[PDB]
Design an enzyme around this catalytic site. Sequence first.
Site, mmCIF file in Angstrom:
data_model
loop_
_atom_site.group_PDB
_atom_site.id
_atom_site.type_symbol
_atom_site.label_atom_id
_atom_site.label_comp_id
_atom_site.label_asym_id
_atom_site.label_seq_id
_atom_site.Cartn_x
_atom_site.Cartn_y
_atom_site.Cartn_z
ATOM 1 N N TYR A 275 -15.282 56.039 -11.871
ATOM 2 C CA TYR A 275 -15.572 55.234 -10.791
ATOM 3 C C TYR A 275 -14.402 54.344 -9.788
ATOM 4 O O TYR A 275 -14.846 54.246 -8.772
ATOM 5 C CB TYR A 275 -16.544 53.969 -11.270
ATOM 6 C CG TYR A 275 -17.975 54.292 -11.708
ATOM 7 C CD1 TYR A 275 -18.934 54.266 -10.906
ATOM 8 C CD2 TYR A 275 -18.064 54.643 -13.121
ATOM 9 C CE1 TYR A 275 -20.268 54.592 -11.311
ATOM 10 C CE2 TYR A 275 -19.147 55.135 -13.539
ATOM 11 C CZ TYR A 275 -20.401 54.884 -12.773
ATOM 12 O OH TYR A 275 -21.744 55.179 -13.094
ATOM 13 N N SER A 276 -13.238 54.584 -10.336
ATOM 14 C CA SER A 276 -11.953 54.231 -9.702
ATOM 15 C C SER A 276 -10.789 55.143 -9.878
ATOM 16 O O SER A 276 -10.835 55.540 -10.948
ATOM 17 C CB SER A 276 -11.985 52.775 -9.656
ATOM 18 O OG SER A 276 -11.528 52.292 -10.907
ATOM 19 N N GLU A 277 -9.766 54.703 -9.221
ATOM 20 C CA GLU A 277 -8.417 55.069 -9.494
ATOM 21 C C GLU A 277 -7.649 53.867 -9.622
ATOM 22 O O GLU A 277 -7.653 53.092 -8.418
ATOM 23 C CB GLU A 277 -7.797 56.097 -8.347
ATOM 24 C CG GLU A 277 -6.832 56.979 -9.040
ATOM 25 C CD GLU A 277 -6.679 58.359 -8.057
ATOM 26 O OE1 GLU A 277 -6.601 58.090 -6.751
ATOM 27 O OE2 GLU A 277 -6.370 59.264 -8.665
ATOM 28 N N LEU B 214 -1.947 54.183 -12.625
ATOM 29 C CA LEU B 214 -2.064 53.772 -14.096
ATOM 30 C C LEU B 214 -3.387 54.342 -14.896
ATOM 31 O O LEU B 214 -3.319 54.769 -16.025
ATOM 32 C CB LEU B 214 -2.322 52.356 -14.299
ATOM 33 C CG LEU B 214 -1.563 51.479 -13.820
ATOM 34 C CD1 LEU B 214 -1.737 50.050 -13.615
ATOM 35 C CD2 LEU B 214 -0.138 51.444 -14.739
ATOM 36 N N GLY B 215 -4.236 55.157 -14.101
ATOM 37 C CA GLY B 215 -5.434 55.790 -14.682
ATOM 38 C C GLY B 215 -6.407 55.934 -13.501
ATOM 39 O O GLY B 215 -6.469 55.675 -12.522
ATOM 40 N N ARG B 216 -7.678 57.056 -14.024
ATOM 41 C CA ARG B 216 -8.672 57.263 -13.062
ATOM 42 C C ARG B 216 -9.733 57.433 -14.002
ATOM 43 O O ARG B 216 -9.836 58.050 -15.077
ATOM 44 C CB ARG B 216 -8.332 58.578 -12.388
ATOM 45 C CG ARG B 216 -9.597 58.839 -11.304
ATOM 46 C CD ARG B 216 -8.922 59.742 -10.107
ATOM 47 N NE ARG B 216 -9.186 61.193 -10.719
ATOM 48 C CZ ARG B 216 -8.380 62.153 -10.248
ATOM 49 N NH1 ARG B 216 -7.451 61.987 -9.235
ATOM 50 N NH2 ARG B 216 -8.410 63.318 -10.884
ATOM 51 N N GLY B 217 -11.090 56.799 -13.709
ATOM 52 C CA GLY B 217 -12.370 56.829 -14.388
ATOM 53 C C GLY B 217 -13.323 57.722 -13.409
ATOM 54 O O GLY B 217 -12.906 58.285 -12.420
ATOM 55 N N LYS C 153 -7.585 48.619 -7.698
ATOM 56 C CA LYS C 153 -8.638 49.618 -7.958
ATOM 57 C C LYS C 153 -9.244 50.155 -6.816
ATOM 58 O O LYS C 153 -10.063 49.459 -6.251
ATOM 59 C CB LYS C 153 -9.511 48.737 -8.938
ATOM 60 C CG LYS C 153 -10.874 49.277 -9.488
ATOM 61 C CD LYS C 153 -11.403 48.456 -10.343
ATOM 62 C CE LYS C 153 -12.690 49.107 -11.008
ATOM 63 N NZ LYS C 153 -13.365 48.106 -11.797
ATOM 64 N N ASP D 293 -19.969 45.612 -20.547
ATOM 65 C CA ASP D 293 -19.191 46.694 -20.815
ATOM 66 C C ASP D 293 -17.790 46.087 -21.840
ATOM 67 O O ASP D 293 -16.768 46.400 -21.610
ATOM 68 C CB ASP D 293 -18.770 47.266 -19.618
ATOM 69 C CG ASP D 293 -18.136 48.744 -19.968
ATOM 70 O OD1 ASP D 293 -18.496 49.427 -20.796
ATOM 71 O OD2 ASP D 293 -17.288 49.184 -19.066
#
Length: 327
Positions: A48-50, A43-46, A66, A154
């Site tokens: 800090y996590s995938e 779904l995504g990657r930042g 996560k 946040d």
Amino acid sequence: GPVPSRARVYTDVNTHRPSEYWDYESHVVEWGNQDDYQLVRKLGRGKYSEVFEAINITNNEKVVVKILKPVAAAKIKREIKILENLRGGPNIITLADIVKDPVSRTPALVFEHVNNTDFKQLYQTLTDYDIRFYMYEILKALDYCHSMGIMHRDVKPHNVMIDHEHRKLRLIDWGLAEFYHPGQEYNVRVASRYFKGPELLVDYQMYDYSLDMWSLGCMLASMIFRKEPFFHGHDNYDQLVRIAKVLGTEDLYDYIDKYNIELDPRFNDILGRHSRKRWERFVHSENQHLVSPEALDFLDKLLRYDHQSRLTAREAMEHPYFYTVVK
Ligand SMILES: Nc1ncnc2c1ncn2[C@@H]1O[C@H](COP(=O)(O)OP(=O)(O)OP(=O)(O)O)[C@@H](O)[C@H]1O
Ligand SMILES: COc1ccc(C)cc1-c1ccc(CN)cc1Cl
């Protein structure tokens, strides 16, 4: 030096509870079985996590996994402890499990899945009634976590999952969340730029739950005025200037004088002198359907420089803006 500050609500929650509650470093993680989860799609990657959509094969229900990056793997216990403390709370995302990912060899948090309606779709079609409705749902989450001695730090649209079909909202991404301890100096490098409170921007470290109320006001302002983001700073310095062009510089100087804060001298050449603008200046034919005297009054009470003067989440729930929302 700076004058100290403490929250006007929920100051004693952490001292009142047992050490095991807030002492996240002493927490022993209860590991689940990674094989219960089959990854479906990324779904995504930042930084800090995938994040992956997955299926819990023990019940065939959709979950979100996560997988924490090593940089986040250091302060994992804080996020776990906060998620476990808040579990079952109103509109708080449920942490379903914690497993060791076989590939990354890091912890992977397993959450309930929310069928999140597209952010563009929500931003463009939520009605005046829906904005009030969802704002009330976010306030339930914020008052709960603040009452539980935790600040989210946040709050922003990407951290609010809305399943519009089922009028269901969840506050997610507790990776920056912290336990509030009166007198503690916190890291100001939290929240996303456009949602950063003036306390962060002027480097005042003794902040509290009220930082979340500023971020919430930023969300509300963008939504009712159709101005994304409302305070559009090019960097953290211009971010304060963008705020000062709306709220005025006099109240900014009163704020820094009250807390005995010395502004970074780089502000002397960019801040200028600005009066406070009346909220009706931002009204136009394309946003008039989302604005009301109650919305303006509510926004006015969130977007205040002085963190101690903002409405608390519980006071915000009492506001006339929510009188029309079915309860
Ligand atoms: N419990 C959940 N249910 C459904 N989707 C989730 C859940 N938790 C996270 N997600 C999704 O995981 C994806 C991961 O994206 P990413 O890590 O880039 O965050 P983001 O939403 O882009 O926030 P940011 O603005 O900080 O990048 C997002 O699209 C988010 O909507
Ligand atoms: C500025 O956005 C918002 C402002 C106010 C409210 C009540 C909600 C939202 C909101 C929250 C979450 C999403 C999807 N991630 C989309 C939107 Cl538009």
